[PDB]
Amino acid sequence: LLQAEKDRRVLQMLRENLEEEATIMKDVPGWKVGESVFHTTRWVTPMMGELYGLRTGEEILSSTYGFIWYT
Amino acid sequence: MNPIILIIILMTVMLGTIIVMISTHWLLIWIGFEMNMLAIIPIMMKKHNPRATEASTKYFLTQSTASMLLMMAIIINLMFSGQWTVMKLFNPMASMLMTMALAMKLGMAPFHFWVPEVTQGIPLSSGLILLTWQKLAPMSVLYQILPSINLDLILTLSILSITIGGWGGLNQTQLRKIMAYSSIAHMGWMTAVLLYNPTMTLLNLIIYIIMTSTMFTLFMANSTTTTLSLSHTWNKAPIMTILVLITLLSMGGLPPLSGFMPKWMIIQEMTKNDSIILPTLMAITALLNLYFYMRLTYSTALTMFPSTNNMKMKWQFPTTKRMTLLPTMTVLSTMLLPLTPILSILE
Amino acid sequence: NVWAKEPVLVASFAIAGLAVILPTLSPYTKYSLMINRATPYNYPVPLRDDGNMPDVPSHPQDPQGPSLEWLKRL
Amino acid sequence: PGIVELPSLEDLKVQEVKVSSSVLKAAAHHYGAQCDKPNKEFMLCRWEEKDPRRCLEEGKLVNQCALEFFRQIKRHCAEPFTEYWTCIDYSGLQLFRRCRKEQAQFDKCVLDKLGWVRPDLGELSKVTKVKTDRPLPENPYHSRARPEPNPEVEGDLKPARHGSRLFFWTM
Amino acid sequence: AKTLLHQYWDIPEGTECHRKTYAATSIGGASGLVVSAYSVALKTPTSFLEGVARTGRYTFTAAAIGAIFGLTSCISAQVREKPDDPLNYLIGGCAGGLTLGARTRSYGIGAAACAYMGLTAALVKMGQLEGWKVFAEPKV
Amino acid sequence: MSLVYMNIMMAFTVSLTGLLMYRSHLMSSLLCLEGMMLSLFILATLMILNSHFTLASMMPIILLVFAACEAALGLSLLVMVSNTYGTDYVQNLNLLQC
Amino acid sequence: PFFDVQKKLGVDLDHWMTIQSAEQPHRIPARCHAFEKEWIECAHGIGSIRAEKECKIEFEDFRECLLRQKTMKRLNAIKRQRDKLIKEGKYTPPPHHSG
Amino acid sequence: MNLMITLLTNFTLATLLVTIAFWLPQPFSMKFFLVAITFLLFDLEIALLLPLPWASQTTNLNTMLTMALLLIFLLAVSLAYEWTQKGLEW
Amino acid sequence: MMTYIVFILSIIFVMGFVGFSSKPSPIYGGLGLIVSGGVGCGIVLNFGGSFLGLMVFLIYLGGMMVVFGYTTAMATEQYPSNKVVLGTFITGLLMEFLMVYYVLKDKEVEIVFKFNGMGDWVIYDTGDSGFFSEEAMGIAALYSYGTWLVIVTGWSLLIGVVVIMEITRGN
Amino acid sequence: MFMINVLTLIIPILLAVAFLTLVERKVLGYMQFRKGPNVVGPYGLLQPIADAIKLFIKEPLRPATSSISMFILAPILALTLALTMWIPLPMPYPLINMNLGVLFMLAMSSLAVYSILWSGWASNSKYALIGALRAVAQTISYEVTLAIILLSVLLMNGSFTLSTLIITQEQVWLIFPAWPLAMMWFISTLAETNRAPFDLTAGPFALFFMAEYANIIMMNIFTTTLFLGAFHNPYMPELYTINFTIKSLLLSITFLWIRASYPRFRYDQLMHLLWKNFLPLTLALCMWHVSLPILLSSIPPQT
């Protein structure tokens, strides 16, 4: 159950974050909207900057660095 | 010194070198080099003179910084494509640092400043074991990781080590410094053909190890430091003189004798490529490093220096040194000329 | 004998030797290995259903699969 | 090069089970008993294809199964299920040996009034078959073909051709 | 370095002149700095002004040899109008050796330097003319 | 590229130049060797953590314990040199000339 | 020389510290497991030269899984562009937490 | 950074204690060296020993027992060697 | 007190390496290596770092610098700063200031690399089910799989013991 | 609230140390035939208040230093260890729950060794340097022993969290499955606190004094958590805190009580005794406490 909620949440961040990118980068030349840099057609695990990117500090610090120095 | 402790230290030298030979992990190679250092330190300072103490200090500092720069190269290798397989590397920078580490490990031209100083103030047994195993241990590693090296590294170190072991070498009558500069020149030779056919490198390693074992066994048969002591060995015994003649001429590499066979095959499988001016330069310098061999032979067995009595006293005692194995190594090292197609015994 | 000579050494050798020997005569080492094996770290991964195999039970209540019962009973 | 194929916001709307953690942890075993039978479909989908954005219908299925299970435990006995999980909530990390008598009380409620025997240890283990409707996938590691085989050298060996064929020492 | 020796050999020789002499002075400054770096590492001048003087002397002499080599290279290539011989760089190496002997202020060293530097420069241009690779194939 | 790796490699060059150029005491050279050791430790450990290279995570502690016993041997050699002399300078070692 | 007593005695005592995807003591993967499995299957029965010139695409995919260089380059370009356009002031940003 | 906050508060309060305590009122032996290196080498062997309570839950228990006894046995051989061979005497 | 705390502790780390690579008296050198080891412990604990960074602290800041300061105390005197030491400290601070200034106000700084210049909250785990702090079970190997490695390590330390006693007058 | 937690830990340490000074003076007085200090108010709590503020008042040692910064840098390190070493100690709820705390204990003990060595070098002329050098030797010779013994007593419990220790102490005290190992551990705590019967024969004397007694109370609290104690029913921490305080107080009185009546050892007797008697015996107890949980089917639930 935790696994299913986790998968839906990370795909939710993927969908919303690529929507944000598609809104934000229509000025630069080139730039396909959602290319993986990789070549194989496989779901790679994202890198915590694809998930928690441009969230402005608070949630990314409480998410990445939470357990590391939480007690 | 206890004999049990010396058997233990020899066991650990053999263990470290066999770990360098046999392993496939990088940490194990580094452990083998370090354990080789740690075991080879108390073979030196076998006596308690300060000469061996300063020699062991210089050796420890250079050997440890070579070991740690090797570890730097491996951690760069895993900063890039990362697995612990002894194979092609994945960085020209890591291969550069690694070959310079191994060039510090075994006697090379920018890095040779510790070799005559470490050999001068030590006895003969420590010098023999350090030359044999400390010029055997990195060659396996270079034989492994040859297919990812910028060639200018190996070739520059080889050329410059051959010409430094040539030119430095015309000035010393300290026999340990003579043998050390000879080691530098031959290690330049044995590193030069690494990227073309390494069978020649390993055969040259076999021939050089057997030659140096013969030479140091002849010096251990009668303790000498200078050439004048060798003239006294001329007075006391005649067969040592013709052995010095044959072994110095086989260090010189003349075509009737077996020391020529490693030069000639190098020139063959070097000139089957487009390298001709580099063989004739290397073989001119091979003509150069024969001159101190030749003046040594002139000092030992062909001209004769004036002698001192109490050699009259030493006539009444026949020789009683034990040789480890002198005559077998001698005729294996010098009459091996018609056995050139024992080249392919190796690979 | 040496019990008067260097006694703490002899006691150390004695407890050393029994620590060497004593796992040979032991009716609990197989219990230790069953306890240590029967604790899962990763997910117990399922499999594609059946080639009509009388194993791999469908309900987790079904005791056809290999379970633990000596745990609850000491 | 290639762009990803993300699912839409139309599939990203399931009634999420926005419940808290200690109640979900204390309500785990009988949720393994009654429900969690059709989510090994989801587990086998996740381990035969390493690709969420594909197995999300079965994620919606386990989401509605867990919500249906908590609906069914919400309507009937127990309401002191609330007392049981708030007895186990404030005890640090939730050891299940903490509130044991009320665990027996909740078990007696659900047993005498509904059924649902608690799974004995170790029955949340013991590798379990699962059949699906979709056929099992092939080569999810989307790669090319294995490029070249080495021709294996065999055949009984001839002797040496005219010796070493070096300069001399023939034969 | 490879970039400036490539800049030297990229010039058709030929006449595209005084870039040749500038590149040769850059070669001389680099080689003088190399050998002077080894010398100031292995001498301990004490004082440091002597160390700067020795490094300046080494760089100045090697740059002078490079400059004079490039000058008579350009002049012989323009005059003879035959850019294929090594005889012009034989003249070049002898001129460089003579001015080496001039800046060390002895004449036998200048004569031997004329001979050896002329032979090496003729061999360098001759090997570039036929084509002998740097240090390797490294294939078989 | 996980930007911190640049700083730790530059820190390695710092410790390596501190190992190579050293004026008076051998103890500073040996301690900068120890600093180089710490640099390799930290750099490889961050790499193995971010890789989830969880099987062979032995490299940090085992690299550490080996090069630590190397530093122990260096301490004993420095004590022997300081025992047979007055000080432990780089000077008063110019005997045994090459 | 490199010897093969490792293969000769039949004791594979050193092949487990070697790569990823050998069986960890609890059956967990690394971060780039499948990329390794396809790369090793690409370059297995191969003389390490057509490994250099044929498995290049999957090797670059594995390298960019391992370090994630150019993906971070793309994300950094997005960050710098976002900074300069919020410096401009167009669309005071609804990419954070709300519209 | 929470324990860094604790470390910062303790460090600042200690510096306040010291500076308000200060603004207000106004050869050698080899035997010294052998014990330290003996500490160092046995401490490194302690560093090899100490992940033992991490390891005791695996499916290879007899081998773990054997190599753990080998580590303490080697440490005991080193101890008894420097014990018998006048390493710590006076 | 903010996001780039790993980068800032790395700045203090390289400052400490400069601070004893300027060659002071070796007890100041031991102080510099202790400060550098403490902030390196801080860096690796920021990556977490649960065992190994507290493990180095007992060895280097627990067993190695103790004997380095011991040997500083018993062997060398250095009985009385200098131009060369503090001048190299100034040039090291200048080089770090220049490199970090070009990291800050530009894209990337290249020795021969491409260091993508921003602070590293990337990369990191996406909140996996760790449950055992993977360092812990990793180092909780070496006794099942680790046959050869711990044997040659302990054997090397034993040979280190006999080497030390021989050079310091075996037997 | 977290800084309030830190200050409620490190405000009563001064109270604890000063009242420990009066308690050790009174208890030595009644092991002897002495009453007092009791002229300074009722039974003398203002007597530690008074001599503490007196030593603050009294004019400091004039330098006579070498690297003033280093000379201040040693006791600041000693007192910040004494402050930062009560963070993971559980009386029922510790300040920071850690994955591992006991290796942090041993590491900060080694930092106390640093404090001793730095004060010894920066102090004075050569004789005090030799004395502090012997002190560093006799301090460092026991961190082998104490870490070995602590490892062998946690090996019965498998995990480092120390709340698993306060769980596993519920049935019996841990003194019963390991009495000789705990006894040798207690002797090692007498070694680490550097008191009688072990010899040590400065500035600021109050700060070195503070580090000493906070080290003693630290080792006593860690002892009381480590080897004995009782259960902890939640939503009532006063019960375990009372029983913990009473047992730690009885053990600290026993500690000073063992100090009260034994002469100091000879130094070579101290090293001789430690190596040749504690070190084979620690190895014997370690190998038996390794081979015994694999015997008796009880390897701990290291989660």
Does D126 contact C47 at a Cβ distance shorter than 8 Å? Answer: no
Q: How far is CA D50 from the centre of its chain?
A: 11
- Cβ-based contacts of H2 with chain A (< 8 Å): 69-71
All domains in chain F, ordered by first residue: 1-86 (1.10.287.3510)
CB burial of residue B46 (10 Å; 0-12, 13-18, 19+): middle
Which tokens sit at C24?
A: 């040979």
Annotated domain spans of chain J? 1-303
Quick one: CA torsion of J25, J30, J34, J40, rounded to 10 degrees?
A: 50
Q: Read out DSSP for B23-35?
A: --SHHHHHHHHHH
B177's tokens: 């410094």
Q: Please state the three-class secondary structure of chain E as a single string.
A: CHHHHHHHHHCCCCCCCCHHHHHHHHHHHHHHHHHHHHHHHCCCCCCHHHHHHHHHHHHHHHHHHHHHHHHHHHHHHHHHCCCCCCHHHHHHHHHHHHHHHHHHCCHHHHHHHHHHHHHHHHHHHHHHHHCCCCCCCCCC
Give the list of residues 6+ apart from residue J83 with CB closer than 8 angstroms, or none.
Answer: H10, H13, H14, J10, J13, J214
Read off φ and ψ for residue F55, nearest 5 degrees.
-75, -60
Q: Which pairs with CB-CB distance under 8 Å and at least 24 residues apart come from G45-53?
A: G45/D146, G45/D149, G45/D150, G46/D147, G46/D148, G46/D150, G47/D150, G48/B87, G48/B88, G48/B147, G50/D147, G50/D148
Place of tokens 């994202």: A46
The structure was resolved to a resolution in Å of 6.5
Q: CA-based diameter of chain F, in Å?
A: 52
CB contact under 8 A, I161 and H81: yes
Number of domains chain H contains? 1
Touching I (3+ Cβ pairs <8 A), the chains are A, B, C, F, G, H, J
Domains in chain I (CATH in brackets) are 2-168 (1.20.120.1200)
Phi, psi of C54, rounded to the nearest 5 degrees:
-85, 45
Sequence-distant (≥ 6) Cβ neighbours of residue B328 within 8 angstroms: none
> In this structure, what DSSP letter does residue J278 have?
I
- State how far residue G8 is from chain B, nearest Cα, in angstroms: 12
Whether the CA torsion A41, A42, A44, A50 is positive or negative: it is: positive
Q: Establish whether chain B is in contact with chain E, requiring a minimum of 3 CB pairs below 8 angstroms.
A: yes
Q: Taking the CA atoms of chain H, what radius of gyration do you get in angstroms? A: 23
In which element (H, E) is residue I164 found?
Answer: helix I148-167
Q: Using CA atoms, how far apart are residues A10 and A27, in angstroms rounded to an integer?
A: 27
Q: Which residue is associated with the tokens 């953590």?
A: F49
Contacts of residue D164 in chain B, CB cutoff 8 Å? 341, 344
Nearest to F93 among B34, B54, B82 (CB): B54
CB within 8 Å of chain D, chain B residues 284-343 = 338, 340-341, 343
- In three-state secondary structure terms, I146 is coil
CA distance E132 to B273: 11
Spell out the residues 6+ positions from residue B284 whose beta carbon is closer than 8 angstroms to its own: none
Helices (H), D14-152: 21-26, 29-33, 40-48, 56-75, 81-89, 101-113
H15 touches chain J (CB under 8 A): yes
Q: How far is D16 from chain J (nearest CA, A)?
A: 31
| CA distance to C48, E41, G32, J215, per residue, from E51 (Å) | 80, 10, 56, 58
Q: How far is CA B108 from CA B60, B132, B156, I88, in A?
A: 17, 15, 10, 31
DSSP B300: I
Distance, CA of B293 to CA of B302 (rounded, Å) = 13
Residue of chain A minimizing CA distance to I48 = A68
* DSSP class of I116: E
Separation of alpha carbons I46 and B21, rounded Å: 39
Q: DSSP strand E in B43-167: where?
A: none
Structure tokens at J36: 């007092």
Residue B119: half-sphere exposure toward Cβ, Cα within 13 Å? 28
Residue I108 β-bridge partners: I116
**How far is CA J258 from each of CA C53, J195, J214, J261, J274, rounded to the nearest angstrom?**
72, 10, 18, 6, 18
Q: What is the CA radius of gyration of chain D?
A: 30
- If you ran DSSP here, which 8-state letter would residue B342 be given? G
Would you call G80 an interface residue with chain D, using a CB distance cutoff of 8 Å? no
C-facing residues of G in 24-83 (CB < 8 A) are 26-28
Give the CA radius of gyration of chain B.
21
Query: 3-class SS at H67?
Result: helix
Owner of token pair 């100490």: H50
Q: How far apart are CA I117 and CA I105, in angstroms?
A: 10
Compute the half-sphere exposure of residue A15: CA atoms within 13 Å on the CB side of its CA. 16
The whole-angstrom distance between A70's CA and the closest CA on chain G is 24
Q: Which amino acid is residue C44, in one-letter code? A: P
Cis peptide before J197 (omega within 30 of 0): yes
Give me the residues paired with residue C48 across strands.
D130
H69 within some domain: yes
Pick the closest to residue J191 from J104, J119, J112 (CA basis).
J112
Please answer whether residues H58 and I143 qualify as being in contact, where contact means their C-beta atoms are separated by less than 8 angstroms.
Answer: yes
Pseudo-torsion of CA J263, J266, J267, J271, nearest 10°? Answer: -90
Tell how strand D129-130 and strand C47-48 pair up: parallel
CA pair distance F45, B277, nearest whole angstrom: 48
- Residues of G with CB below 8 A from D50's CB? 34
Chains B and F touch (3+ CB pairs under 8 A): yes
Sequence letter at residue C3: W
Rounded CA gap, I59 and I56, in Å? 5
A14 CB within 8 Å of a chain D CB: yes
Q: CA C32, CA J297: separation in Å to the nearest integer?
A: 5
Name the experimental technique: cryo-EM
Distance CA D163, CA B324 (A): 37
What would the two tokens of residue J95 be? Answer: 């300040």
Q: Do A40 and D141 touch (CB under 8 A)?
A: yes
Residue from the list I27, I54, I63 with its beta carbon closest to the beta carbon of J103: I54
Q: Tell me the nearest-neighbour CA distance from J143 into chain H, angstroms.
A: 8
- Cα I22 vs. chain centroid, distance in angstroms? 17
**Domain ranges (residues) in chain D:** 1-137
Q: How far is H40 from chain C (nearest CA, A)?
A: 24
Interacting residues of G43 by C-beta distance below 8 A, sequence separation 6+: G51, G55
Q: Which of G32, G19, G30, G18 is nearest to G68 (CA)?
A: G32
Q: How far is H75 from chain J (nearest CA, A)?
A: 9
DSSP characters over G13-60: -SSSSSSSSS--SS----TTHHHHHHHHHHSSSS-SSHHHHHSHHHHH
Residue B106 DSSP SS3: helix
Which of B240, B224, B235 is CA-nearest to residue B304?
Answer: B235
- The partner residues of F25 in beta bridges, in order of sequence, read F89
d(CA A20, CA G94): 8
Q: How far apart are CA J78 and CA J208, in angstroms?
A: 7
Asked if B31 has any chain G CB less than 8 Å from its own CB, the reply is no
Q: By residue range, what is the domain housing residue H30?
A: 1-85
Tokens of B270: 């070097």
Contacts of I163 in chain B (CB under 8 A): 38-39, 41-42
CB contact under 8 A, J3 and H9: yes
CA distance J216 to chain H (A): 19
Instruction: Give the bridge partners for C47, in sequence order.
Output: D129
Tokens 């020993």 found at: H49
Residues 12-41 of G with CB under 8 A from F: 16-18, 20, 22, 24-25, 28-32
Q: Positive or negative, the Cα torsion across A2, A8, A9, A11?
A: positive
Residue H90 forms part of a structural domain: no
Q: Do chain F and J touch: 3 or more Cβ pairs under 8 angstroms?
A: no
CB B27 within 8 A of CB B54: no
Contacts of I13 (CB under 8 A, 6+ apart): F11, I36, I39, I40, I43
F55 neighbors G20 (Cβ within 8 angstroms): yes
Q: What are the beta bridge partners of residue E94?
A: none
The two tokens of residue B234 are 């001329």
Residue I6: its chain A contacts at CB < 8 A? none
